Structure 1
């Protein structure tokens, strides 16, 4: 019949077929379910969406139309749960959150 992609069937933007292949050749298990790559692709897509949402918001706050690594850093660090998820991750060219000790201030 006319081909329909697994991503299209799953209602996703992220590639289910590619994710499946990566699972198969990643030596994770002897067999893989069909639903596994669908689920995984969906989760990855969702997380990507949350981060791009916050980073885009940060980009608009700086009167900017293009997201840069700084915006990703602002997005991640000002979000408690993303900050937890990426607690051991370095964002290149992200810098740091503005934060000075109030006590130190004159």
Structure 2
């Protein structure tokens, strides 16, 4: 929570930052992260593997229309098509 506040103050995003901003931003980033990893883990289980690799990230992202809409321009190295 502290790191977010520090980066905000040092980034010139605004001259002042309220107390509630970092908890909200952290909750958002945690939610999105859990959503990504849950699908990547399911794809790994579906591939009888036990360690997640970039290919699984590509397959999980490109199979969801919402994540694919958010990350339409992003290129994943070693991801392929």
Does the TM-score normalized on the shorter chain lie above 0.5? yes
For 1:1-31, what per-residue CA distance to the aligned partner results, in whole angstroms no more than 9, with x for missing partners?
xxxxxxxxxxxxxxx1111111111110000
| 1:29-50 Cα deviation digits (max 9, x unpaired) | 0001121111111101110110
Rounded Cα–Cα distance in structure 2 between residues aligned with 1:92 and 1:19: 27
Q: What displacement does 1:92 show?
A: 1.0
Q: How many residues were matched structurally?
A: 80
Higher relative contact order (CA 8 A, sep 6+): 2
Q: Mind listing any 5+ residue stretches in structure 1 that lack a counterpart?
A: 1-15, 96-106
In 2, distance between residues paired with 1:59 and 1:48? Answer: 17
Task: Give ranges in structure 2 of 5+ residues lacking alignment.
Answer: none
Partners of 1:72 and 1:92 lie apart in 2 by 11
Based on CA coordinates, which of the two structures has the bigger radius of gyration? Answer: 1
TM-score normalized with structure 1 length: 0.73
Larger proportion of helix: 2
Q: Deviation digits for residues 33-89 of structure 1, max 9, x if unmatched?
A: 121111111101110110001111111111111111111111100011000110110
Counterpart CA distance in 1 for 2:51 and 2:78 is 15
